[PDB]
Amino acid sequence: AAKDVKFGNDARVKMLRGVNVLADAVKVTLGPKGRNVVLDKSFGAPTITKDGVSVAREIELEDKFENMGAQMVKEVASKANDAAGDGTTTATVLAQAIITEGLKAVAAGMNPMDLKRGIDKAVTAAVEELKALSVPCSDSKAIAQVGTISANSDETVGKLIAEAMDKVGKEGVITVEDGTGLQDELDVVEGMQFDRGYLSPYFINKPETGAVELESPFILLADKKISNIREMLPVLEAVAKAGKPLLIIAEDVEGEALATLVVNTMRGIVKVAAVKAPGFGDRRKAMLQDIATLTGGTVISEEIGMELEKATLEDLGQAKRVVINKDTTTIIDGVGEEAAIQGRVAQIRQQIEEATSDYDREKLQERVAKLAGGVAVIKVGAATEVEMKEKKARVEDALHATRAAVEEGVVAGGGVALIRVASKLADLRGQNEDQNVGIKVALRAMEAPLRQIVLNCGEEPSVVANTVKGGDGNYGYNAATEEYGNMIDMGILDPTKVTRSALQYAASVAGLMITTECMVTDLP
Amino acid sequence: AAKDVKFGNDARVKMLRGVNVLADAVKVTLGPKGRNVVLDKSFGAPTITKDGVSVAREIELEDKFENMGAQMVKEVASKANDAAGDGTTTATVLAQAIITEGLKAVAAGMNPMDLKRGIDKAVTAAVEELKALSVPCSDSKAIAQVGTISANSDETVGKLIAEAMDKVGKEGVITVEDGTGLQDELDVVEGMQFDRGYLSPYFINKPETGAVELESPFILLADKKISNIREMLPVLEAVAKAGKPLLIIAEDVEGEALATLVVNTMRGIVKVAAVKAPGFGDRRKAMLQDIATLTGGTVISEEIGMELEKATLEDLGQAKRVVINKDTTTIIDGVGEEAAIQGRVAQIRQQIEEATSDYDREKLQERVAKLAGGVAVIKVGAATEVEMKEKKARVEDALHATRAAVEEGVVAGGGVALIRVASKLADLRGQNEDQNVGIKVALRAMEAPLRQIVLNCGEEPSVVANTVKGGDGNYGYNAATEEYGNMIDMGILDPTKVTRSALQYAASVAGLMITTECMVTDLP
Amino acid sequence: AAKDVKFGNDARVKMLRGVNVLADAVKVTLGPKGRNVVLDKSFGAPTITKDGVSVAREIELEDKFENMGAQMVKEVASKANDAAGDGTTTATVLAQAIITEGLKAVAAGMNPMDLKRGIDKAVTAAVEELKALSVPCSDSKAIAQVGTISANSDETVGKLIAEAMDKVGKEGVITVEDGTGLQDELDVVEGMQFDRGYLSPYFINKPETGAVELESPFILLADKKISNIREMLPVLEAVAKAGKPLLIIAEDVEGEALATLVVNTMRGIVKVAAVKAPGFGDRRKAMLQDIATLTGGTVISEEIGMELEKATLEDLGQAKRVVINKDTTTIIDGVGEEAAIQGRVAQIRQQIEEATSDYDREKLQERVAKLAGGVAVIKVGAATEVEMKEKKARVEDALHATRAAVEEGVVAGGGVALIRVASKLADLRGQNEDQNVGIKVALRAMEAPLRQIVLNCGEEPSVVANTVKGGDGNYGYNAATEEYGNMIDMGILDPTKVTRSALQYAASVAGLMITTECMVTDLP
Structure with a gap:
């Protein structure tokens, strides 16, 4: 059909509004103090979830261009999910972040393509960094901690999961179904x-x-x-x-x-x-x-x-x-x-x-x-159906998270890991200036997770971030307790692998996205 | 399709307007002085019922968002029905209640998620409470009272029902069919x-x-x-x-x-x-x-x-x-x-x-x-068809209620039980303040059933409720007689099980609902 | 259907606006400092490419006439692809160029048909010219240089390709598929x-x-x-x-x-x-x-x-x-x-x-x-899917380009070759005046590639072009390093064959296009 082409700033802007809408709609659900979103459904009753990717998918904009940008970012939230079924929201936040800045720099008059590279490198860098901090998650305790943390701070979960793993073993299978009663239940086939x-x-x-x-x-x-x-x-x-x-x-x-x-x-x-x-x-x-x-x-x-x-x-x-x-x-x-x-x-x-x-x-x-091993199943308890859903949903993320933590270790949550590896690359540089900005941009965006979390607590994102940046190692703010300290001793762990996928997938797209100079689509 | 996302207050409001419409349309039918609603039907002639769940289902709003709200609360009304086939209206009222307050507190600037917990806990508490007051319903007398009370105060019913159960036994089966004449009739297969x-x-x-x-x-x-x-x-x-x-x-x-x-x-x-x-x-x-x-x-x-x-x-x-x-x-x-x-x-x-x-x-x-046992059937008397429907309907509610009271005992009606256990949790507290509010919110809502009933009698809901709260044990207002006294001796009994389900189901959704920060749906 | 005919200038203009739209949308992606474009897709997610022909195809205009013009130029970008799978963008640039000038000259009052001939001739000439400078690309080094330069300056590519060719031989087969990991990988069947x-x-x-x-x-x-x-x-x-x-x-x-x-x-x-x-x-x-x-x-x-x-x-x-x-x-x-x-x-x-x-x-x-020979396959690395595409894409271009350099040699990139052969035909003349302009027109357009490249670097197209034209042989501007020198020593090579097809296909249509005096199509 007849198309509608847009170039430079106009196009970009549109693209960005598109992104924002999506992003903004997914942010709300980040962290212990994250909130929920309701997805309508002609099907049955509306859905209430805090699962970032769940949200992403439902976002489609009337504006063809605004929509396109949305339709792109949407994939990071997605891929992130296929990778390790968690961190989705978090990932998104970083794109939103990277892109915003990126565009600002292109608007600054820099070569987008170098910005991209600057970002890419800064990331390749950031990854080794994490693999450094990653420490083996092997005891049942730690495992219970990731499950718990994943399931928006529900101990019962991590607890249960930890158990299952402790039983069926490493190659033992684990699945979650809707439970009969209201209590969660664990069955193990022998x-x-x-x-x-x-x-x-x-x-x-x-x-x-x-x-x-x-x-x-x-x-x-x-x-x-x-x-x-x-x-x-x-x-x-x-x-x-x-x-x-x-x-x-x-x-x-x-x-x-x-x-x-x-x-x-x-x-x-x-x-x-x-x-x-x-x-x-x-x-x-x-x-x-x-x-x-x-x-x-x-x-x-x-x-x-x-x-x-x-x-x-x-x-x-x-x-x-x-x-x-x-x-x-x-x-x-x-x-x-x-x-x-x-x-x-x-x-x-x-x-x-x-x-x-x-x-x-x-x-x-x-x-x-x-x-030789064992098979386990988990029955999620819920009074309602709109509950069993959400519940059973989070239960799986955790289920995955743990699976990821085990195979790839963990690092400090609260988005401290990133914020930490950022300081570590304070001296990273590229072939030219644009590229250095491209790097700075990225490092800058790595504060996103942390400060969205904070913001989801009605608190100064910038003030916390500061005191947190002032610390060392795993010093970190506990949004839940509203007090700083050691993220690990507090059991606030992120399976290294997700943190990594989120950053990669996020950048992988954001990077490209910020190098748009023209956009084509159908007419209204 | 292109969506329409709404965040914060705006979204919430809409949501609430939606709930209200539904709720309000179901309230009207609460208690002996409950009134009826007419559900149109392209099918044949309109339907006239006082069955809350019957109504709920029919409610669909034009405002996609107002509608979502309604589509959600609608499930409490529903689940309540699958659970024990009665208390539907009542349940609904609580949600309406919980939500109202809840949102108001989110508007107050409190973390919704704690609000939720506060409520949740307050409830788990309220439940043991009921299990406390529940007292065995075994004599035919009692059984006739719940049937009667259930069938909007029709003695003939509780009477007949009591009989049946007294015959077919405990495991004897009982069903209701449209009768031939105008008199209700009980048949018992031997x-x-x-x-x-x-x-x-x-x-x-x-x-x-x-x-x-x-x-x-x-x-x-x-x-x-x-x-x-x-x-x-x-x-x-x-x-x-x-x-x-x-x-x-x-x-x-x-x-x-x-x-x-x-x-x-x-x-x-x-x-x-x-x-x-x-x-x-x-x-x-x-x-x-x-x-x-x-x-x-x-x-x-x-x-x-x-x-x-x-x-x-x-x-x-x-x-x-x-x-x-x-x-x-x-x-x-x-x-x-x-x-x-x-x-x-x-x-x-x-x-x-x-x-x-x-x-x-x-x-x-x-x-x-x-x-071994016996089988029974009841034939409902009615001159018309629009009557035979309503009649036969309530008859079953009671048929279920009894069943429920039997297996799970009973407690004082008039929404006194709840108002009572609320006072009992006057000192319940949670991990933080938001949570205490969350709790308080819930207790506050448990006065809903009672004071809606009162309002359905054109009387001061707040005045009654007070005098009722001044009392102890089963002191309660008798809406029908317009005079206080002992709810049990008056035979105003609610099968413990329903009262409980209504509170649970209600909270279960309400809780989530008040933690909405965004909403997605299609465009108008 | 009822038609809408337009003659002379009106038609032409429309036709041109059409061309420009298409053209402009493909230019943005020229050279190392080339940018990307996003093709929407109802299918799945939008597409982000820098492949000129990929773009061309998606462009369709609402104005029936502006559309026709676009639908025409579109074929150069197209044929150029069937010929040697690269140079597409570049080719397009030249047409845009030729046409602009051409029309201006028809507007100047010249006989279009001679303008055409003048161009045609001018081109036949320019071709021998290239065949002259074409010099054999045979060593693995050179081969990796075109690969690399083709794959928007990615050595890893030219590098890899160079190897494959160096293995499978001259008649060995080579194909690219999506790899599993994120690293590019080369497999060779024996x-x-x-x-x-x-x-x-x-x-x-x-x-x-x-x-x-x-x-x-x-x-x-x-x-x-x-x-x-x-x-x-x-x-x-x-x-x-x-x-x-x-x-x-x-x-x-x-x-x-x-x-x-x-x-x-x-x-x-x-x-x-x-x-x-x-x-x-x-x-x-x-x-x-x-x-x-x-x-x-x-x-x-x-x-x-x-x-x-x-x-x-x-x-x-x-x-x-x-x-x-x-x-x-x-x-x-x-x-x-x-x-x-x-x-x-x-x-x-x-x-x-x-x-x-x-x-x-x-x-x-x-x-x-x-x-007798050997078969080879390349697996492209990419985190996302929207990355795996673009990547794998360019990879093929190069795969092609090499294939072409080998069979037809190479010449200096940066669109120097053309700008160079242009000066060589400074004395070319034809049967009459119009024709001479026709020629001059063409030569003038051969600076297009170069200065679009420059412009995609936010620099004076005309200034560079001058200094570059002041030079001799393979003196050329290096957009990437932002400094002049020998284009070959710098490994900035264009497979002779593409450069030639681009010019030919471009002219072949441009020529005709500028001889439009009437246009017929349907009504809006």
């Missing part, structure tokens, strides 16, 4: 288990709820359904022989097998029952050897060198016992050597370091966790 | 009975209307239909032998079977007839063992280790007699040991405490009531 | 390899990730799928005898074959496995002889004078070994004489020089590179 119920409800062992407890069973794995393919009695009778319970897994099982199966297990002929494998072809199949191997079984390559009956009783796997309901199955413990275990695990290392990451390493580690 | 008529209309025993009364029959249950599968005479003749009438249940029955059956019961060979089982597959089948075991019969696992004829006359279950029409069957009594009865009941305990609640525990408790 | 993984995952030789390494295998090539056509064991067993591993290639393979194949390679009968050929019918088949001939194999003319088993073990090709995962296959080295190699290559010469050029000579030289 050993091997999955989401499959029994097809033979009649085959319930001891307890109710479909509770099956095949004492010392022989696990059996397949690659097809069993309508009338019931042929396999050898294998079957082989255990009727040993007189041990039997667990089964495969594409499925028709009543033909079940029926007879019912009365067999009934008459006391053979205590047995079966449940379907995971889910999709490559899925389920991809997950069985593990199972077998675990319990010491011999998966049936219905597709390779094997067949139905085509298999001995010793091929089966063995485990202490099992527990099944109409939706889940669990193995108490399949006697299978660690040489096998860590083995089946070791081969997961390539699966691990994958160029797929998102979705891959996900369902991946899951098994990895079930394959 | 023993076992469902909604299936006879396929063989010709097989009518004694009375008319298709009235069947097979004396000392043999009940038979299957899992299939019988077109030409008429093969089964062994089992048949076995009874022709015994000379007893026969009842049948299964997926269905074709004339082939019927035809022959007709003349058989006719010529006096075998007095019999049958009727289809419950409804859906997993439905009906799920409901048969129960039938069997009861009368002492052996359901036919047409699908498992069983077939047609394959079953002895002894497998059949027995009962005194039965009564069927063209739409309902009923077993006078199937001699089946209590070992079996309570057994089939005890195993319902897991079905009971189910993470399904809504829809599950319903049809569930139903059978439960039929497997 | 020998023969394509994008096909193993269908027999179980057939993983040594390493994980599905790593197969058939040591000294026999390669097999076919023209069909092998479900049950398993027939061919003579061929199979043939190698089972020689005890060598085996690689296969054809339409496909079904389990029937795999399954058995599995246990064979398992039992240590015959270590083998297979992977599908390239892709489409003509495709895959097109690429096999090459493979065969390479390893010294005999492709199976399943469609001609051959069949399944119909083929001896000696038909098979042989290679050191192979490397396969779930996605790619690679031959370490098929022992195949060079008489064969360069032969299968020599025949590619006709394929090469083709009238299809685009898409033809692409996938073409690919094999060519794989049939």
Whole structure:
């Protein structure tokens, strides 16, 4: 369509107003004294969140140009989220900051392109700086501190999380769902288990709820359904022989097998029952050897060198016992050597370091966790729904933050780290003057986080910042207690990684943004 | 789409105007001197209700922002209803209340987030408080009082309700339907009975209307239909032998079977007839063992280790007699040991405490009531339809209220309970000042219910409230009689559970709401 | 539709405003001190580029006539891209330039048609001129210089490119993809390899990730799928005898074959496995002889004078070994004489020089590179996405530019070359006066590039231009260092070919454009 082009200052200005609106709408939610924003929804009821990125996304401006600037900055808040799911708001603040200044300098008559570089360098610099301050977050305490700090100062959270991690381990999986009650709840799965119920409800062992407890069973794995393919009695009778319970897994099982199966297990002929494998072809199949191997079984390559009956009783796997309901199955413990275990695990290392990451390493580690480690889930408590949301939301950030803290350590919160590394680069210079300004600009913006925080407390951003800059190391203002001191001893930690991503992502765009000289878009 | 963001005061105000509209439109219906509201409907004729939640839902504002506010408070009114189906209006009032004050304090320049905490704490407190005053509602008298009080002071109601509960028991099921005449009517089903008529209309025993009364029959249950599968005479003749009438249940029955059956019961060979089982597959089948075991019969696992004829006359279950029409069957009594009865009941305990609640525990408790207790239904009398609606409505509120009072006890109505526990927390304080205000705010709001009721009587809300606050325990104003006294002895009872939910749900949202600093929505 | 015709000056003016808009919007991005532009997108986020042609495309004007003018000049910026993927901005500058002056001269009352010729001639001349100064770019140093200068002065780029070229050779292929990290990364494939993984995952030789390494295998090539056509064991067993591993290639393979194949390679009968050929019918088949001939194999003319088993073990090709995962296959080295190699290559010469050029000579030289040379890929580093683009973008430009400098040499950048050849034609004349102006016009415009560059540095375009014109040979202003000197010694090189296309394409349209006397289009 016919366009509307704008150059220089006009364009910039527009762009900036755009940015500001977005920014301003995200600032409000920064820090312990951060406030909330309400996002409307034709869908259901409006949403109340303090999650910066959540906000960002909803901002769209009528002014095509104002809008563009907004639509750009929006991505820092975004990328920041994909990186480590937290720090979003914070990040944004820095862009807002950088850009403002930047533009002011371009308006000053400097070459934007050098400004950019000056900034870029000043940042590359600022990063090593942080990696310096980053200190390992390893004890459960520290971890509880980041979770807590992340969840807008909710101890219960960090506390819970810390626990989970302390249990499921390092490669143990952790997820959060809506809770039934109003209290938060932590459930931890032990050993091997999955989401499959029994097809033979009649085959319930001891307890109710479909509770099956095949004492010392022989696990059996397949690659097809069993309508009338019931042929396999050898294998079957082989255990009727040993007189041990039997667990089964495969594409499925028709009543033909079940029926007879019912009365067999009934008459006391053979205590047995079966449940379907995971889910999709490559899925389920991809997950069985593990199972077998675990319990010491011999998966049936219905597709390779094997067949139905085509298999001995010793091929089966063995485990202490099992527990099944109409939706889940669990193995108490399949006697299978660690040489096998860590083995089946070791081969997961390539699966691990994958160029797929998102979705891959996900369902991946899951098994990895079930394959020796543990799986945990958290149920968030809330009276309302607009509450469960917000709540469960913050719970995840924290969940991520901790994950980031662990892999990349932490540094002093309250935006002191940055403010601190800024002083450290007070002597950083570039190829030319513009560039030096470009650097100064950035350093200057690094005070943003801190003083937005302060401002969210109705206090002098500039006065605090000062006294804070006067200090050393981790001397920092505690907005919550309204008194200075050691940010770390006070447990106000920021996972090094977020602080870093926020600065990078922020600049990465701000940088470009301030080098706009023309803008094109459609007509009103 | 292009948005419209609003920050601080502006946003808040709008939000509040929105709340108010909603609230105000729901207040009007509070208390005995509560009035009605009319909800238009393109559908048919307008609706006239005094049900707060019914109203809330209908409120939508043109001002995107005023609307958001309303869309939010609307949820308290809602949740309150999912929780215990009553107190809705009341709940709302508190929010309205909490928010008003809250905002005023934010305007005062206080940190909203502490305000929130202050409130939250003040509430957690207020709750134990109630759990304190809650006293067991067990006698039918009390139960009639909550029903009555619930149904805007209609004794006939509480009266009827009390009766029902007194009959069907504790686990007996109770439902309300539009009645035929103008008088309310209570029907109570005794023993076992469902909604299936006879396929063989010709097989009518004694009375008319298709009235069947097979004396000392043999009940038979299957899992299939019988077109030409008429093969089964062994089992048949076995009874022709015994000379007893026969009842049948299964997926269905074709004339082939019927035809022959007709003349058989006719010529006096075998007095019999049958009727289809419950409804859906997993439905009906799920409901048969129960039938069997009861009368002492052996359901036919047409699908498992069983077939047609394959079953002895002894497998059949027995009962005194039965009564069927063209739409309902009923077993006078199937001699089946209590070992079996309570057994089939005890195993319902897991079905009971189910993470399904809504829809599950319903049809569930139903059978439960039929497997020992009793079932009841109420027919509401009304000349018109616009009446039959309102009437029948309130009837349920009470039906729920009672249910709630039973399980969670009760406390003094007139919003005295709250006003009372408020005084009890006159010394509650929080971590900082803002928080103390936050608390104070909340206590202050707990006078809302009471003084709205008063206002709904054209009387000094503040004057009453005072005298009421001067009193102790359950001293309370009786809006209806316009005179003070003991709220309990007067039978003005509120099921503890509602009073509690209304406060919780109300705060839960209100709290968040007063921490709004920005709002985003689409353009006008 | 009803039209709107405009004649002479009116039309022209409109047409010009149109051009200017477009032009002006592309100028901003010229040179090291070039700035960026933002192209909005309803799609996702806005785009930030410095790529002239990228911009051009987005420009459309509301004024039907102003629009036409823009729609015209737009093609120079365009064609310039199809020609050598760079110089786009620059080209545009010249048109803008030529047109302006031209029109002014038509307004001067000259015959436009001669103006055109004068220009055309002036250009043909200027071209030989360049071809004169063009000097061979052959050393890696020079090659990195154009890369670098093309990628807005990024050495890392020219550096990287220089290397790749220095590896893959002259006919080696080079491509750029988004990298994983933030660092740019260069990967170079050695020998023969394509994008096909193993269908027999179980057939993983040594390493994980599905790593197969058939040591000294026999390669097999076919023209069909092998479900049950398993027939061919003579061929199979043939190698089972020689005890060598085996690689296969054809339409496909079904389990029937795999399954058995599995246990064979398992039992240590015959270590083998297979992977599908390239892709489409003509495709895959097109690429096999090459493979065969390479390893010294005999492709199976399943469609001609051959069949399944119909083929001896000696038909098979042989290679050191192979490397396969779930996605790619690679031959370490098929022992195949060079008489064969360069032969299968020599025949590619006709394929090469083709009238299809685009898409033809692409996938073409690919094999060519794989049939003796080497394949290379570059991964671009970027924190954001809006960065990864711009970055990766320029990277290609350079990738192109080099490609051009090599085949057509280079000349002095900073638009000196042109300004230089301009002085060389100071005595060029044509058939009549108008024509002489036509020439003069053109020469005059060749200062455009230079002084736009200067202007993008906030400096006197005319002042620099002078001092630069006062110089000789490669004396030129260095915008970046803001100081004059030898453009070549400074490594500021422009692939001769681009400079030429830019001038040509520019004039080609400009010329015509200035001979507009009427314009037709639709009504507003």
